[PDB]
């Protein structure tokens, strides 16, 4: 299991490598055997979509007590947590972990 | 809808009425037309079970923000909330309502 947390896999999701194909600017009219360092400056843009299916383990506790849950707070604030501000920059308030429910040992 | 909250029904669950059948102590040997007020003192005991099936409406929010949830608190206390104390008497800490999730208007 990775020490920073997560799922350790022998064969994780493969790396996806992407490159703009070099387009030479224009060769000299007489032949030259050197490797054509002059190129047309360009960049690419696009859309990428990732779809992951996750299997869940539903909590099945017989505990009578109400449990601890992650919640937002109902107190007036300048900004909404996990939103954008007046500038338009999105920010995340605190690091949310996954351990809120309980189980017996 | 009932003003104290709940589901108003024309035909709610019917009342279940229960009574110990009176057992007369012992009648006089000569006949008397009066209605036999002398009885054997007795009480009944038993087990009662109630089974209710509830239909649920699953929350289907597209809200990015984490929501407010009912939770117990992780702070050291003399007793566990919604448990028994050293005496053995069960108590309920506060009145829990049903409105914690959110919807658009």
Largest CA distance in chain B: 87
Q: Tokens in use for B34? A: 């009066």
HSE-up of residue A104 (Cα within 13 Å, Cβ side) = 4
A-B CB pairs within 8 A amount to 46
Per the CB < 8 A criterion, the answer to whether A90 and A83 are in contact is yes
Q: Tokens in use for B63? A: 């809200």
Q: Tokens in use for B22? A: 């009176």
> Nearest 5°: CA angle at A20, between A14 and A25?
160
Q: Which residues of A touch B96 (CB under 8 A)?
A: 66
Q: At A20, give phi and psi (nearest 5°).
A: -70, 130
Q: Is the dihedral of CA B56, B97, A72, B79 positive or negative?
A: negative
- Cα separation values, A13 from A1, A4, A5, A50, A52, Å: 16, 18, 16, 12, 11
> Nearest 5°: CA angle at B81, between B76 and B83?
120
CA–CA distance, A84 with A76 (Å, rounded to integer): 16
Question: Does the beta carbon of A95 lie under 8 angstroms from any beta carbon of chain B?
Answer: no
Q: Tokens in use for A42? A: 């360009």
Q: Is the dihedral of CA B20, B25, B29, B34 positive or negative?
A: negative
Q: What is the DSSP letter of A84?
A: B
Partners of B24 in the β-ladder: B39
Q: What is the dihedral of CA A59, A63, A66, A71, to 10 degrees?
A: -20
Q: Tokens in use for B100? A: 């914690």
| DSSP secondary structure string for all residues of B1-32 | --TTSS---SS-SPP----PPP-B----SS--
Method of determination used here: cryo-EM
CA of B68: which chain A residue's CA is closest? A71
When computed from its CA atoms, the radius of gyration of chain A, rounded to whole angstroms, is 26
Residues 50-79 of A with CB under 8 A from B: 64-74
CB contact burial B62-90 (16+ within 10 A = b; e otherwise): eeeeeebeeebeeeeeeeeebeeeeeeee
Q: Which single residue is written with the structure tokens 């799922």?
A: A7
Partners of B90 in the β-ladder: B84
In angstroms, this model's resolution equals 2.8
Q: Which residues of B touch A68 (CB under 8 A)?
A: 71-74
Q: Are residues A71 and B71, on separate chains, in Cβ contact within 8 Å?
A: yes
């Amino acid at each position: 299991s990775p020490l920073m947390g997560g799922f350790g896999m022998k064969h994780p999701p493969p790396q996806i490598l992407i490159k703009n194909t070099p387009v030479p600017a224009d060769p000299p009219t007489a032949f030259n055997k050197d490797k054509l360092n002059s190129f047309i400056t360009q960049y690419s843009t696009g859309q990428v979509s990732v779809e992951i299916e996750w299997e869940l383990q539903k909590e099945n506790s017989k505990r009578w007590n109400p449990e601890i849950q992650y919640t937002s707070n109902y107190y007036k604030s300048n900004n909404v947590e996990f939103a954008v501000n007046t500038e338009g920059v999105y920010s995340e308030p605190r690091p949310i972990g996954t351990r809120y429910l309980t189980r017996n040992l």
